[PDB]
Amino acid sequence: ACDYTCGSNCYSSSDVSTAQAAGYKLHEDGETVGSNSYPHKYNNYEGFDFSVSSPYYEWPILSSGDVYSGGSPGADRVVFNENNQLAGVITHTGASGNNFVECT
């Protein structure tokens, strides 16, 4: 029941989880993926309704349902916390630069 479509996606909170598990696992290990430092804090602000408690961790979401491993994952990105939850589904969808925005 895709609930988070990043323009060209279809991974509801059920799909995000998978992506999160990645961000978390690596997070719980304190490791990163790629040349960047993901996951990492994402202290929302743009106006995200994260039905989760902080801190919020931003992580990329692979439309393939895999675990990112680079610096440039894509517009599609999942946000969570240190609990194993999901903040939502952000995307570089013309967010107006490097800004993020909850997918559709």
Swiss-Prot record:
GO cellular component entries: cell septum; hyphal tip
Reaction catalyzed: [RNA] containing guanosine + H2O = an [RNA fragment]-3'-guanosine-3'-phosphate + a 5'-hydroxy-ribonucleotide-3'-[RNA fragment]
Domain of life: Eukaryota
Glycosyltransferase recorded as keyword: no
Active site: H40, E58, H92
Any one GO molecular function term: lyase activity
Cysteine pairings via disulfide bonds: C2-C10, C6-C103
UniProt keyword list: Disulfide bond, Endonuclease, Hydrolase, Lyase, Nuclease, Signal
Enzyme Commission code: 4.6.1.24
Sequence similarity: Belongs to the ribonuclease N1/T1 family.
Subunit structure: Monomer.
Official protein name in the record: Guanyl-specific ribonuclease T1
Source lineage: Eukaryota, Fungi, Dikarya, Ascomycota, Pezizomycotina
Residues of the full protein shown: 27 to 130 of 130
